[PDB]
Amino acid sequence: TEMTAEVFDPRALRDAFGAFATGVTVVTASDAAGKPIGFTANSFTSVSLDPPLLLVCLAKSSRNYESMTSAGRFAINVLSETQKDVSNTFARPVEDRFAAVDWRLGRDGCPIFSDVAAWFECSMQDIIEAGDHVIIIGRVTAFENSGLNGLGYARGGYFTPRLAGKAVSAAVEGEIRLGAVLEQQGAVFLAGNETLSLPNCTVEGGDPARTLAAYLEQLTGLNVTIGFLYSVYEDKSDGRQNIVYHALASDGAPRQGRFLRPAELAAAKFSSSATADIINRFVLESSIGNFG
């Protein structure tokens, strides 16, 4: 009597929601047995100041769904720049998630993580049914705010204020190799056939994003948008400073190279260990995120 048929492309919609940048939280609580349970959530909002109200959304598909909705108290841990691993641990299917964080129990028995950007001890007010998820509303009972910069998530992956500084230091040291994790759908652009390499060009001076956008657009014949810094490092083998950006390509077949889905990258040979590390990160940050 209701219409069970796809209207929008789940990828297209998920990617559109991704345009709105968010920080990263880890929702924590204790199950019926008193065992700490948790999950990474970026679908969080500050609701009211008087009374102190907060919001977070949990998928009905969650393993912890029953334990969570049944819990009376929960805590929101707003992760800092250095807590990329916590976000991954608490989003990935791991045996003991709480073994990846230094944590303690709050005044109201909720797992509070250390070195976080901010944390909030809550009491559940209401659980609102909303599609494939539920809206959990909590009343802030206790909180703390360290000046600590928070871990961010925009579009594909994480961003941190840290990297801008790291990039500037590298840029002054000498020439930089400007690389990019250029995504089409969920497919990363890679140059070569037998030994795949990320698109890059080594320059000294100018706006790295402007330079890289021009290079990529020329290379692929596609329209490109350079986003947040992905990684800044010194190649241990090469010796060269490396500035890697997260980027997006318009639809179509590129002039040269190809866009590969994580499934195709499984048994692929890479230009360098660094290149492989970045691809490993891309495929892992592809196996995670809100919705399916």
Add this chain to the structure above:
Amino acid sequence: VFDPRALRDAFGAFATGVTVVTASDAAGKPIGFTANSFTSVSLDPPLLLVCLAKSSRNYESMTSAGRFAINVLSETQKDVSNTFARPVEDRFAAVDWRLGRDGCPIFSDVAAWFECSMQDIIEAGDHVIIIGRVTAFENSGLNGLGYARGGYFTPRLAGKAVSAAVEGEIRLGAVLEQQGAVFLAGNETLSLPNCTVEGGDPARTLAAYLEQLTGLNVTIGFLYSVYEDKSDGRQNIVYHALASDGAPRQGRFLRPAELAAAKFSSSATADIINRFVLESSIGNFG
């Protein structure tokens, strides 16, 4: 029980994008508001969330509307965000916009936009939770305007900074906040705290400088502004920063109220202070 500033500042730790919720009132006139307390709720059915203060002027018009739209602003749309947070007579004069298939104001050059139908309005304290079912949407690859802690951040600035850094020496400045007070050096002619260097991590350098200067603990945040001083000729990298509690060794933390008839070191310094006081008179909650 809780300090509204302390709590507001704690919520601010969680970065967001910047949306402009739009609709048409009973008279059919376009209405809108800047909102950052937005969340993607469900994929099947497509569900979305945005919070509106009960104190809002448009509160009655909004809750009474059946359809609305979400405008996920891009990096270049700081001033759109400002217009729609501030009380101006013609807000819609500040944006190139059109009406969507369901008669909602859709802005051009946005990072993404969502056309919705109201599903429910949930009462939640000094605000209401508006739930919308997506009827249409569009996503340009465009980077979004971001809001973390006291102000805006954009991916743009990282690149802008790197270009400047390679050109030569940079003046590293900071919008260093204590409570709602910005740190300023000098007595008659106030200047933002800064030091000119060539090489190293600008954030590391600035944290060291500020901590030494003030005798306070500092956290350097997102890039605030990158520009070339028109008078000086010097490249300027300005960071958003935070100071621990207490009186600084030198200089002083001034409230927007105290800055009103204050003389500044340069027009640029004044532009940044103007921006600080304006992005102080805006943000979620009153």
